[PDB]
Amino acid sequence: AKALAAGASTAMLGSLLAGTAESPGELIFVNGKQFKSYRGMGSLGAFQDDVLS
């Protein structure tokens, strides 16, 4: 709401959608809880020819 009130017409969402069921990656179980992976495009683990990634 703050981003749209500042003048932006659209908001792009990252981690808020990473843990959903429709996102890629395998579901992980840790101590009775459920988690999913999330990494940036500039991370060490992650065609990424971006110099400033």
Ligand X SMILES: O=c1[nH]cnc2c1ncn2[C@@H]1O[C@H](COP(=O)(O)O)[C@@H](O)[C@H]1O
Exposed e or buried b per residue across 2-13, where buried means at least 16 C-beta atoms within 10 angstroms of its C-beta: eeeeeeeeeeee
Q: Considering only residues 5, 41, 44, 52, which one is a binding residue for ligand X as defined by CB under 6 A?
A: 41
Task: Report the alpha-carbon distance of residue 17 to residue 35 in Å, rounded.
Answer: 13
| Binding positions for ligand X, 1-40, rule CB under 6 A | 12-16, 40
Kindly tell me which of 12 and 52 has the beta carbon lying closer to its own copies.
52
Q: Across-strand partners of 33?
A: 30
Per CB under 8 A, residues contacting its own copies are: 1-2, 5-7, 32-34, 51-52
Per CB under 6 A, residues contacting ligand X are: 12-16, 40-43, 53
